[PDB]
Structure formats: C-alpha cells, structure tokens
Amino acid sequence: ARIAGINIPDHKHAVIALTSIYGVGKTRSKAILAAAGIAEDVKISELSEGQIDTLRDEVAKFVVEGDLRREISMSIKRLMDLGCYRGLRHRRGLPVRGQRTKTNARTRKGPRKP
Amino acid sequence: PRRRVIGQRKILPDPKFGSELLAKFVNILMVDGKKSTAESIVYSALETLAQRSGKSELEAFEVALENVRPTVEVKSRRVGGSTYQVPVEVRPVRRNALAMRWIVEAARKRGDKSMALRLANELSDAAENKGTAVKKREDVHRMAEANKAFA
Amino acid sequence: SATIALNKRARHEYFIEEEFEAGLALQGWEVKSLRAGKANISDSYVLLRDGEAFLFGANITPMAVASTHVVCDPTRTRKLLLNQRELDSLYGRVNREGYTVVALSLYWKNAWCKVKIGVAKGKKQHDKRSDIKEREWQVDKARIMKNAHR
RNA sequence: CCAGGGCUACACACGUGCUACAAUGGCGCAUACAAAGAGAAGCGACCUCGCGAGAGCAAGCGGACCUCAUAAAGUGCGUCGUAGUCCGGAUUGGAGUCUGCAACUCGACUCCAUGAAGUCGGAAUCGCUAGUAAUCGUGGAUCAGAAUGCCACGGUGAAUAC
RNA sequence: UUGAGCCUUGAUGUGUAGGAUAGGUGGGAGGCUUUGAAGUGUGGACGCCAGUCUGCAUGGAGCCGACCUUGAAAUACCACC
RNA sequence: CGCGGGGUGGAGCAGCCUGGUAGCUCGUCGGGCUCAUAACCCGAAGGUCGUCGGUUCAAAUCCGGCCCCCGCAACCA
RNA sequence: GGGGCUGAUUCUGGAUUCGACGGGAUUUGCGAAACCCAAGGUGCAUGCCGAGGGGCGGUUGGCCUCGUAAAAAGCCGCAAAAAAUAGUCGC
C-alpha cells in the first residue's frame, strides 16, 4: 500500500512498484528492495503487512521526493540567481551541456508550437 | 520490365511439410531478416486454429483462402484525362498472392496480445468470410463491378 | 460572401504553396471603403523587417471623402495582425530570392478584415509555357480518349 | 609571433542521418555461430581492485602463434499483457572515468536520479528487382582525445516485375 | 361518354396473442349437409401475399359454433351496416 | 369579422385516415475514391408527429381545444 | 443657395481585429534602481583642491585616474554602414 512518500502502486512488480515515486528509479529501488527481503514480481496485495511497513524506513535512507523536489531548485539557485553560465542557458530555455543550438535541441526549448 | 521476362522466385517447401502456401506465409511475416522467429509464430497461428476449429493444419487455411481470394480487381490504368480504373482479371499467380497479402496484413491490425494470436483470430472469420478479408475483398468488388467493361 | 477584389492573376504568375488567414489592421476611413469603395489588390506583397509584415499593394481610395486635417493616402503599407507562430517562421522560408508572401483574396470574418495571405514562389517564363500547354494537354487527352467510344 | 575567444553562437527555414512510436517485442537468465581488419614513443590480455566506465599489476605481439575481441540477431526458459505501459530515451541535477599542458565555453563518456517529445508521419518524394530491400553486429581510415558521418566486412533474410 | 348521388350486391379490415384478411357494437350454441359433403383440379379474386375468398365438375355425403391458446372472441347464422 | 386547411429529424416531404409496430431524401459526418481533387458509390445521424386535454384495450393517428402559417370575402366611424 | 436621403450588417444599445504591436495588471526569478541595515569580510582610505581622459577632439556637471601631477575607461561626429535588401520581364 502507501509507503513513506506517497508510493501507492497497483499489483505490479515490487521493484517497478517502488519506481512510482520521484527520486528513485528501477536500479536504485532494487538496492532498496535488497534489504526488504521480498521477491521482485510479487504484487502489492501479495506484499505482506510485515514487509510494507519496513519499506518506509528503507526509502527514507536515501533522500527522496519529500525533500529532493527542492534540491533541483537549490542547484538551480547556484546557477539561476548566481549568474553562472549554465544558469543563463537554464533561464531562457537553452541547452546547458553544449548541444548544437543552431538547429537541434528542440525539446530543451519545448514544443514547436511556433 | 521492358524486355526482362525472367521467371519468378522459386518457392521452397516449408520446414514442417511440403507446401508452397504455408511457406509463403513464413516469407511474408519476415521482419528485419528474422525468419526463424517468423517461423514460430506462423506455426502457432494454424495449430492453435486446428485446436480452435477442430481441423487439420493444411485444411484450416486451404478452405479459408477460397473466401479471401478475389476474382477481378480494378487496376488504376488511367492515362490522365479521366480517373478511370479499368478492371483486370487477376492472374492466378497473383490471385492467391493478393489473397495472402490481405490476411497477413490484417494480422498486423488489431494488435492485442501476440501475432500468433492475432493471425489465428483473423483466419477463422476469414475461413467463413466474416472478417477483414471479406471487408477488403468486397470493397474491391464495389469498385470493380461498378466499372464493368472498358477498352 | 463578403469577399473583396482578389488577385486571381497571381495564380498565373505565382504557384503559391501554403496559405494563411491573418488579419489586417486598418484605419477608420479604410473600413467604410472596404465593404464598398473601390479597394484594389493587384501586386500585393510584403516588406518584413522584424515583425512588420505589411500588405503592400492594396489600392483602396475613400469613396465618400472622410479625410480632414492630417493626410490620408489611398495606398499604404497596412499592418497585418500576424500570429507569433506564423511570424518567426518567416525569418526562414521567405528569404530565398523568389520567395514572397502575397494576398490572394480579401474578405470579412464577421465585420473584421481578415486577408487570405499566401507564400508565393514565382514562375519563370520558361515553365509558364509548360503550364499553359499542360492545361490544354489535359483537355485534349480525353478528346483522344473519347474517340475510342466516338 | 603571442595569450584568450570565435569557427560549438539561434525568434528561424532546409538537406542528410541515427532513434523510435514495441509484444515477429521489451526485460532477466541460459546458450551457439564469421570475415574484414588493425598494433609498437602501439595492441594490451590474464590476474587484482573498483557496481562500472576504468585503474593497479603486466605476459605475448612490429603478427596464421600475442592483443584488440565477450559477436548480435538466433535458440530455449522465465517474465511483461496493449499501455504513450516494464515503450522510447531526449532534457536535466549530483558523483566519477580517460585523452591532453589543460575538457569553462567544448570532448567522449560511466554510475545514480529526472522523465519528456513522440502512439505510425498530409501534399509531395526516393531506393531496389537480388544475397536485393530489410535487419543485426564487427573492424578500419582520420585521430593526443573525440562520429548517428566515411570506408570495409560478417550474420539472417524477402516480396513483386502483368 | 365522364364523374358524382343513392338502390341492389359481393368484395372489404393478421397492436399482441394466434389455426384464423377476428372491424366495431350485439342477438345468439346449433347451424348445416347429400334441393349433392369433407376436401380435390384449379380459374379468378386477393393480400400487412398471412393465407383466405372461391366458379365448376370429379369428388360424392360431412363440416364447423360455445368449444381453444386469446385484452377480447368466434362471419355456426346475422342485425346497423 | 368568421370561413378553408396544414403544422412532424437542422431542412423540405410521407406514414395518421381505412387506429396501435415515425420514415424518406436535401444539408451533414463515416468511409471508399484518387499524379491530385471530384464525378460517383455506399456507412451513419437525427423530431414521440405545433401544444394541451379527452375518447379509446390501443392517440403521431381520432375528437375536443389552444397556438402558429396563412388563404378568403368582408372593411360606411 | 435651401429641402430630403445615406453615412462601417444589425438598419435602436451589450465589438469578442483568433494574432507580434501600444498599454496596464497579476503570478513568478530576484537584482543599491526593482533597497536599506557597519554588520560577515574588513586599516589605513574617502571627499573636495590639483588632474588627464580610448584612434582624433570632447565627454557624464560628473569619471576607470592622479599623494600634488601625465597616463589609464563607457560615450559623441570621425571611421570595418549595407544594398538588386518581394516577385516577374529586358539591352
């Protein structure tokens, strides 16, 4: 059922069940589920109550959605309000890692509505 | 083309039994060079249909192809002045070939679970002309019989 | 309907590919003269610099004179109300030495001047002979075709 | 002649590419099969360590012996059950790798996190009739490092031409 | 001739049940049959073509009514029509 | 002023009557169709019948109304 | 010269140029102009005199500068400012 962030899956694989929250993907959640002592493909209904509550502390070890959603803004605050080179590209929808801005890098700008 | 009247590609027998019809089904589902993978699905299309229709492997399709097979199709032999499709009686080499292309392409349509399952469901109704095969064939005859004779 | 004079001769001279329904801003004396009042449309093109797409060739003179004090000239570069989607793309495929934006027709959209504008490409005269031949070629082809049935 | 920047700028158009939009598939496990090649101020095993990119250690090789180099699709098993999902991976933050005096502009990347656009492409258009289209890999040139480009090779394998 | 008017007369009308081309209202269980029957060959009528109306003669001498499923009921017989 | 009828899919016309079991096509979209469109072919959609009551086993039907479109002779305050 | 008519499709009230453009406002990222607090850094500097200002001259009524006087930056005319700045047709 519900785990610490929100983490409410529907009867999927337990590794992929943990992927529904921001801040942890499939490969990281397997290391999270490594200490859980449960199978990969067991469903949420097949996840026992004695193991669901132990999943709240495991996902609380690594920093997750409850505090990681502002960690991107802090790194943005190190660039956007600090006037760095990446922040100048970050503010006006430009690539920051050196994409060819002449033709490509469309999805960094956004949709091609114009 | 202009002068090349070379013969067609010789059809090998299928690697379960000698059959030009079933081996043509193996060679029509081949995608990205994978014919061994195409061999497995096209085998499960009729053998499951044999367990669905209570028939054999070589008769669940042979009586099925008769419904799919057309008689006269309208080629678009228009010179440019008039958009006229003068009909041509389809050659017997292309008569089953036009039939076999209609049903396997219909298996690509309605993708629910697997191409083995989709082709089996698209062949039982085609065995009694109540699928997309008779939808394809009779729609040609709508455009064929409405334009009967031209020179 | 509410259509005004249209540049039908532009189709003989240009082979326009894509069209638009951008609106045109116009002065107070223009609106009265637009429904009736002898508006002409020949040699209509554009003079873009940044966002200043102007209907250039549009001779519309005031029929009943409504001009006082300051000047009022019948031929002006009227400002077009263009979408921003339709604006940035004209920094590209209109600057190709032969590419231009022309107005095929003029009309109304519920008492608003919306002008059907299109990106012309322009025919050289060596291919102008082919198109006039082709139009006669299509007609005479079925004349040969009908003689089989006489 | 020098150091830094620029040739990597982008409200925009066009050409050519790779990647898909999946269940003939994706993922996990098991498992079998080639040639083109290239190398010494280079190829670098094996082993050790690092999740790894790689580092430490270091044999053989200027070569039918040594090394790059584990082939993939395929097959089998497990798993997924028609969704923009376990598709696609762009964008993006943090931590590291190698190149070289140096990687901010601006390298390739690896690890973790993010998760998009995109659900089949109008009008129009090309390629080819065979080991072809198609697909999957591999090497090489250039190169300190650095290609979806270029050249070369291998595997599977059509359809139709009235 | 052409229509209308009315006399005489057959034809003439299966929501749904249902064997029924049963109209309504209504008096009614014996009408009727060899002063040639059930039911034939069918003609034509016919029609929501369901199946009746149905000449003649063979057939030759029985059939239907309350009776039955029906909202209702029986042209077994009729009266207003 | 009181005489003649009909009002029904978005549209124009029928079924009603000789009761019960609402359609047609025009305009629409769905497809075919196609160097391209279209000719033309079919697929689909729509009002409980102008409204309100009564009779009737049975109302779109029939009858009472009411309303609307009108047509009409009236028209000497 | 007088009278009548018409004066953006509504011809008696409910304009909504589908648009960059001109304008205001809101949310949002925060900047001595979108700010102040001597506090964190922080001891010998600031202001007026003198003082020259890129290539030329000047230049903010005030400046990158000057420990008592000739060199260094933004900017103004000068100067690297471009052109069939839609088509199409000609000698």
Curated annotation (Swiss-Prot), chain B:
One of its GO terms (molecular function) is mRNA binding. Coiled coil: none annotated. Keywords: Ribonucleoprotein, Ribosomal protein, RNA-binding, rRNA-binding, tRNA-binding. The keyword NAD does not apply. GO terms for cellular component: cytoplasm; cytosol; cytosolic small ribosomal subunit; membrane; ribosome. The keyword Protein biosynthesis does not apply. One of its GO terms (biological process) is negative regulation of translation. The strain K12 sequence is shown. Part of the 30S ribosomal subunit. Contacts proteins S9 and S11. Cross-links to IF3 and the P and E site tRNAs. Belongs to the universal ribosomal protein uS7 family. One of the primary rRNA binding proteins, it binds directly to 16S rRNA where it nucleates assembly of the head domain of the 30S subunit. Is located at the subunit interface close to the decoding center, where it has been shown to contact mRNA. Has been shown to contact tRNA in both the P and E sites; it probably blocks exit of the E site tRNA. Protein S7 is also a translational repressor protein; it regulates the expression of the str operon members to different degrees by binding to its mRNA. This is Small ribosomal subunit protein uS7. It comes from Escherichia coli (strain K12). The chain holds residues 2 to 152 of 179 of the full protein.
